[PDB]
Amino acid sequence: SGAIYVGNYRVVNRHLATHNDWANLVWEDSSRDLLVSSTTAQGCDTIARCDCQTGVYYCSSRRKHYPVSFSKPSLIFVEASEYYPARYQSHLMLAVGHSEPGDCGGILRCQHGVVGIVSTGGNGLVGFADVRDLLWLDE
Ligand SMILES: COc1cccc(CN2C[C@@H](C(N)=O)CCC2=O)c1
Ligand SMILES: [Zn+2]
């Protein structure tokens, strides 16, 4: 679990969104595993607007943060799960690191701010859903 709070928005993994997120829906994209809902309280986070390929992410299954080198946002094949059929997930960035299903929502940050959230994993890999292209989050 985990979310990004920026301005009047809350960003979560689409497969983990609550009834409240869907009742206050702003935007969702099943192909990115992202959903954005509106909030009344002002958000605590800043979004990175950069091309960084190194950063640090929170791994809840280890209660630790890990430094990672990650690929550029791209279309990657993701195996079927209880939440989606087998499909290509877009705007996904891969890195070597520990991740288990419950780790989705952990934030990945660089020196400029929030880069994305954990969305995929297994086999010593961790995938992050990028949010840096969502410029409207800042307004
Ligand atoms: C860290 O996330 C992991 C780790 C191992 C396995 C998985 C598998 N999986 C893929 C997610 C997707 N973005 O399609 C949906 C939910 C899910 O359990 C995730
Ligand atoms: Zn950066």
XYZ file of N, CA and C and ligand atoms in Angstrom:
437
model
N 0.818 -1.208 0.000
C 0.000 0.000 0.000
C 0.865 1.278 0.000
N 0.252 2.420 -0.325
C 0.952 3.695 -0.362
C 0.343 4.672 -1.355
N 0.507 5.974 -1.110
C -0.058 6.984 -2.006
C 0.819 8.231 -2.031
N 0.699 9.032 -3.091
C 1.367 10.326 -3.219
C 0.285 11.378 -3.024
N 0.531 12.379 -2.205
C -0.433 13.456 -1.963
C 0.126 14.745 -2.472
N -0.376 15.261 -3.593
C 0.154 16.515 -4.160
C -1.004 17.448 -4.487
N -0.982 18.656 -3.929
C -2.065 19.621 -4.093
C -3.371 19.030 -3.608
N -4.385 19.097 -4.455
C -5.668 18.507 -4.118
C -5.855 17.147 -4.751
N -4.754 16.381 -4.913
C -4.784 15.068 -5.542
C -4.131 13.984 -4.687
N -4.610 12.740 -4.856
C -4.058 11.545 -4.222
C -3.778 10.550 -5.371
N -2.534 10.078 -5.499
C -2.164 9.141 -6.561
C -1.958 7.756 -5.941
N -2.638 6.743 -6.440
C -2.509 5.379 -5.911
C -2.372 4.356 -7.051
N -2.028 3.080 -6.718
C -2.059 2.011 -7.716
C -3.546 1.795 -8.020
N -3.908 1.722 -9.293
C -5.316 1.536 -9.682
C -5.926 0.274 -9.043
N -5.143 -0.835 -8.982
C -5.664 -2.074 -8.387
C -5.879 -2.001 -6.856
N -5.347 -0.961 -6.206
C -5.516 -0.792 -4.754
C -6.441 0.396 -4.398
N -7.018 1.094 -5.403
C -7.898 2.230 -5.115
C -9.117 1.798 -4.295
N -9.558 2.644 -3.368
C -10.705 2.345 -2.507
C -12.042 2.804 -3.129
N -13.206 2.512 -2.464
C -14.494 3.042 -2.927
C -14.446 4.590 -2.944
N -13.752 5.196 -1.953
C -13.598 6.637 -1.855
C -12.795 7.219 -3.012
N -11.705 6.556 -3.414
C -10.922 7.000 -4.579
C -11.804 7.013 -5.845
N -12.587 5.949 -6.062
C -13.434 5.862 -7.260
C -14.599 6.867 -7.214
N -15.091 7.184 -6.011
C -16.170 8.179 -5.867
C -15.671 9.618 -6.099
N -14.357 9.856 -5.973
C -13.738 11.166 -6.183
C -12.726 11.087 -7.342
N -13.021 10.255 -8.355
C -12.133 9.998 -9.486
C -11.824 11.232 -10.307
N -10.537 11.449 -10.638
C -10.098 12.524 -11.528
C -9.605 11.890 -12.844
N -8.804 10.831 -12.728
C -8.212 10.180 -13.897
C -7.752 8.775 -13.531
N -7.927 7.830 -14.429
C -7.414 6.469 -14.225
C -6.928 5.875 -15.536
N -5.922 5.017 -15.467
C -5.397 4.372 -16.673
C -5.002 2.959 -16.308
N -5.826 1.974 -16.694
C -5.581 0.566 -16.414
C -4.245 0.101 -17.020
N -3.868 0.656 -18.188
C -2.608 0.257 -18.821
C -1.366 0.789 -18.040
N -1.532 1.764 -17.139
C -0.421 2.256 -16.293
C -0.501 1.782 -14.840
N -1.632 1.137 -14.454
C -1.912 0.760 -13.074
C -1.970 2.023 -12.205
N -2.480 3.172 -12.738
C -2.577 4.398 -11.931
C -4.018 4.881 -11.793
N -4.307 5.521 -10.679
C -5.574 6.189 -10.448
C -5.286 7.437 -9.608
N -5.945 8.548 -9.944
C -5.827 9.802 -9.217
C -7.218 10.221 -8.741
N -7.335 10.505 -7.456
C -8.587 10.981 -6.864
C -8.376 12.373 -6.238
N -9.467 13.131 -6.041
C -9.357 14.463 -5.455
C -9.514 14.425 -3.941
N -8.811 15.319 -3.246
C -8.832 15.422 -1.793
C -9.232 16.852 -1.393
N -9.714 17.029 -0.169
C -10.035 18.360 0.354
C -8.792 18.970 1.055
N -7.947 18.124 1.662
C -6.757 18.591 2.356
C -5.582 18.738 1.375
N -4.703 19.712 1.634
C -3.529 19.978 0.806
C -2.456 18.903 0.994
N -1.959 18.367 -0.112
C -0.964 17.307 -0.116
C 0.428 17.692 0.329
N 1.115 16.724 0.932
C 2.438 16.862 1.494
C 3.629 16.758 0.482
N 3.466 16.079 -0.677
C 4.537 15.765 -1.654
C 4.802 16.762 -2.846
N 6.012 16.681 -3.449
C 6.491 17.412 -4.640
C 6.781 16.353 -5.719
N 6.425 16.600 -7.006
C 6.712 15.656 -8.091
C 7.982 16.092 -8.837
N 8.868 15.147 -9.141
C 10.073 15.390 -9.935
C 9.699 15.652 -11.396
N 10.374 16.589 -12.027
C 10.163 16.892 -13.458
C 11.582 16.798 -13.990
N 12.001 15.575 -14.343
C 13.397 15.303 -14.676
C 13.518 14.014 -15.477
N 14.767 13.658 -15.838
C 15.059 12.408 -16.537
C 15.983 11.510 -15.716
N 15.972 11.638 -14.375
C 16.795 10.817 -13.490
C 16.548 9.341 -13.741
N 17.600 8.542 -13.643
C 17.534 7.088 -13.721
C 18.137 6.434 -12.470
N 18.344 7.206 -11.390
C 18.803 6.689 -10.104
C 17.905 7.349 -9.043
N 17.674 6.624 -7.972
C 16.819 7.114 -6.902
C 16.766 6.113 -5.778
N 15.838 6.332 -4.853
C 15.671 5.485 -3.670
C 14.178 5.141 -3.529
N 13.840 3.880 -3.220
C 12.436 3.497 -3.025
C 12.182 2.841 -1.680
N 10.948 2.943 -1.181
C 10.609 2.313 0.071
C 10.052 0.904 -0.206
N 10.630 -0.103 0.470
C 10.235 -1.508 0.379
C 9.564 -1.927 1.709
N 8.221 -1.932 1.757
C 7.516 -2.275 3.006
C 7.760 -3.697 3.491
N 8.042 -4.645 2.570
C 8.329 -6.043 2.959
C 9.714 -6.247 3.599
N 10.513 -5.179 3.676
C 11.801 -5.170 4.339
C 11.896 -4.016 5.359
N 10.859 -3.119 5.458
C 10.865 -1.914 6.303
C 12.151 -1.107 6.063
N 12.536 -0.988 4.799
C 13.809 -0.354 4.429
C 13.658 0.407 3.126
N 14.546 1.370 2.913
C 14.659 2.080 1.659
C 15.899 1.510 0.939
N 15.831 1.381 -0.377
C 16.956 0.875 -1.176
C 17.269 1.809 -2.334
N 18.567 2.016 -2.594
C 18.955 2.803 -3.774
C 18.831 1.925 -5.042
N 18.372 2.495 -6.157
C 18.209 1.735 -7.389
C 18.595 2.530 -8.621
N 18.983 1.806 -9.681
C 19.214 2.330 -11.026
C 18.014 1.771 -11.812
N 17.248 2.641 -12.473
C 16.028 2.184 -13.127
C 15.977 2.582 -14.600
N 15.315 1.750 -15.419
C 15.155 2.021 -16.852
C 14.182 3.186 -17.132
N 14.206 3.736 -18.371
C 13.316 4.819 -18.756
C 11.865 4.297 -18.868
N 10.843 5.154 -18.644
C 9.444 4.696 -18.752
C 9.156 4.044 -20.107
N 8.602 2.827 -20.085
C 8.376 2.095 -21.320
C 7.242 1.056 -21.215
N 6.896 0.410 -22.360
C 5.847 -0.617 -22.491
C 6.493 -1.960 -22.148
N 6.110 -2.567 -21.035
C 6.706 -3.820 -20.591
C 5.636 -4.882 -20.385
N 5.897 -6.137 -20.821
C 4.960 -7.230 -20.618
C 4.894 -7.605 -19.124
N 3.676 -7.694 -18.556
C 3.475 -8.057 -17.161
C 2.551 -9.268 -17.126
N 2.965 -10.313 -16.419
C 2.209 -11.558 -16.280
C 0.854 -11.343 -15.608
N -0.079 -12.278 -15.841
C -1.399 -12.198 -15.232
C -1.297 -12.268 -13.706
N -2.167 -11.514 -13.015
C -2.267 -11.518 -11.557
C -3.753 -11.641 -11.179
N -4.086 -11.617 -9.878
C -5.488 -11.598 -9.463
C -6.183 -10.269 -9.860
N -5.410 -9.234 -10.261
C -5.954 -7.924 -10.571
C -6.027 -7.606 -12.050
N -5.176 -8.223 -12.864
C -5.179 -7.959 -14.297
C -4.917 -9.221 -15.111
N -5.436 -9.275 -16.350
C -4.987 -10.340 -17.263
C -3.537 -10.037 -17.714
N -2.877 -10.986 -18.414
C -1.530 -10.728 -18.945
C -1.641 -9.563 -19.962
N -0.758 -8.556 -19.860
C -0.861 -7.380 -20.728
C 0.457 -6.593 -20.790
N 0.546 -5.568 -21.664
C 1.697 -4.658 -21.645
C 1.296 -3.474 -20.762
N 2.099 -3.161 -19.753
C 1.852 -2.020 -18.881
C 2.758 -0.898 -19.401
N 2.207 0.290 -19.639
C 2.991 1.413 -20.164
C 3.542 2.304 -19.039
N 4.502 3.187 -19.387
C 5.129 4.143 -18.475
C 5.723 3.413 -17.245
N 6.227 2.175 -17.444
C 6.791 1.363 -16.365
C 8.321 1.409 -16.427
N 8.988 1.441 -15.266
C 10.452 1.505 -15.188
C 10.926 0.349 -14.339
N 11.865 -0.469 -14.838
C 12.328 -1.616 -14.070
C 13.665 -1.363 -13.406
N 13.880 -2.069 -12.308
C 15.140 -2.019 -11.574
C 15.334 -3.369 -10.873
N 16.571 -3.671 -10.506
C 16.881 -4.867 -9.732
C 16.671 -4.487 -8.256
N 15.905 -5.279 -7.539
C 15.606 -5.028 -6.140
C 14.463 -5.897 -5.647
N 14.304 -5.974 -4.322
C 13.264 -6.783 -3.726
C 11.891 -6.140 -3.787
N 10.887 -6.932 -4.172
C 9.504 -6.471 -4.162
C 8.589 -7.683 -4.158
N 7.563 -7.598 -3.357
C 6.501 -8.578 -3.172
C 5.177 -7.837 -3.440
N 4.077 -8.545 -3.788
C 2.822 -7.834 -4.129
C 2.389 -6.688 -3.194
N 2.475 -6.916 -1.875
C 2.116 -5.921 -0.870
C 2.976 -4.660 -0.898
N 4.093 -4.672 -1.655
C 4.986 -3.508 -1.753
C 4.470 -2.414 -2.691
N 3.413 -2.683 -3.471
C 2.856 -1.683 -4.399
C 2.418 -0.432 -3.629
N 2.770 0.739 -4.135
C 2.454 1.984 -3.447
C 3.661 2.617 -2.775
N 4.754 1.857 -2.600
C 5.991 2.404 -2.039
C 6.545 3.457 -2.997
N 6.975 4.612 -2.482
C 7.413 5.709 -3.319
C 8.848 5.579 -3.764
N 9.123 5.959 -5.018
C 10.477 6.044 -5.545
C 10.754 7.566 -5.688
N 11.856 8.050 -5.126
C 12.232 9.456 -5.130
C 13.649 9.648 -5.673
N 13.887 10.780 -6.353
C 15.248 11.196 -6.744
C 15.504 12.541 -5.992
N 16.607 13.246 -6.291
C 16.882 14.537 -5.636
C 15.833 15.614 -5.967
N 15.042 15.426 -7.042
C 14.046 16.409 -7.467
C 12.636 16.183 -6.919
N 12.383 15.028 -6.301
C 11.059 14.739 -5.772
C 10.569 13.349 -6.110
N 9.251 13.147 -6.023
C 8.625 11.867 -6.304
C 8.693 11.540 -7.787
N 9.237 10.365 -8.111
C 9.370 9.879 -9.472
C 8.171 8.952 -9.828
N 7.833 8.036 -8.924
C 6.750 7.088 -9.176
C 6.448 6.177 -8.006
N 5.613 5.142 -8.230
C 5.289 4.208 -7.153
C 5.521 2.766 -7.589
N 5.834 1.882 -6.628
C 5.981 0.453 -6.921
C 4.671 -0.099 -7.522
N 4.785 -0.869 -8.613
C 3.621 -1.421 -9.287
C 3.815 -2.885 -9.667
N 5.057 -3.313 -9.979
C 5.299 -4.720 -10.358
C 6.536 -5.294 -9.625
N 6.791 -6.593 -9.768
C 7.967 -7.186 -9.154
C 8.098 -8.674 -9.332
N 8.882 -9.270 -8.445
C 9.170 -10.689 -8.444
C 10.521 -10.974 -9.074
N 11.131 -12.105 -8.708
C 12.405 -12.586 -9.275
C 13.599 -11.662 -9.060
N 13.567 -10.873 -8.006
C 14.626 -9.910 -7.749
C 14.497 -8.654 -8.601
N 13.317 -8.408 -9.211
C 13.037 -7.175 -9.953
C 11.957 -6.356 -9.202
N 11.929 -5.040 -9.459
C 10.901 -4.145 -8.946
C 10.567 -3.150 -10.079
N 9.281 -2.978 -10.390
C 8.818 -2.052 -11.417
C 8.074 -0.874 -10.817
N 8.307 0.332 -11.340
C 7.691 1.551 -10.821
C 6.841 2.202 -11.905
N 5.625 2.596 -11.543
C 4.734 3.354 -12.411
C 5.212 4.830 -12.352
N 5.676 5.376 -13.468
C 6.153 6.760 -13.530
C 5.001 7.762 -13.403
N 5.251 8.888 -12.700
C 4.247 9.952 -12.615
C 4.802 11.316 -13.109
N 6.079 11.372 -13.534
C 6.753 12.612 -13.926
C 6.160 13.293 -15.132
N 5.465 12.548 -16.002
C 4.829 13.152 -17.180
C 3.471 13.783 -16.878
N 2.885 13.522 -15.694
C 1.567 14.034 -15.338
C 1.705 15.487 -14.840
N 1.896 16.436 -15.775
C 2.150 17.839 -15.398
C 0.993 18.510 -14.669
N -0.247 18.113 -14.994
C -1.450 18.667 -14.371
C -1.532 18.401 -12.855
N -0.732 17.449 -12.322
C -0.727 17.186 -10.877
C -0.312 18.443 -10.081
N 0.562 19.290 -10.669
C 1.133 20.526 -10.117
C 0.212 21.740 -10.217
N -0.981 21.591 -10.788
C -1.909 22.704 -10.942
C -3.322 22.247 -10.580
C 5.766 -5.202 -6.192
O 4.648 -5.677 -6.939
C 4.590 -7.012 -7.227
C 5.471 -8.018 -6.858
C 5.247 -9.305 -7.314
C 4.158 -9.582 -8.125
C 3.267 -8.579 -8.488
C 2.104 -8.874 -9.406
N 1.118 -7.788 -9.480
C 1.249 -6.979 -10.699
C 0.519 -5.630 -10.584
C 0.444 -4.969 -11.949
N 0.907 -3.731 -12.031
O -0.036 -5.562 -12.919
C -0.889 -5.904 -10.033
C -0.853 -6.578 -8.658
C 0.163 -7.688 -8.532
O 0.107 -8.466 -7.592
C 3.485 -7.288 -8.020
Zn 15.279 13.697 -10.682
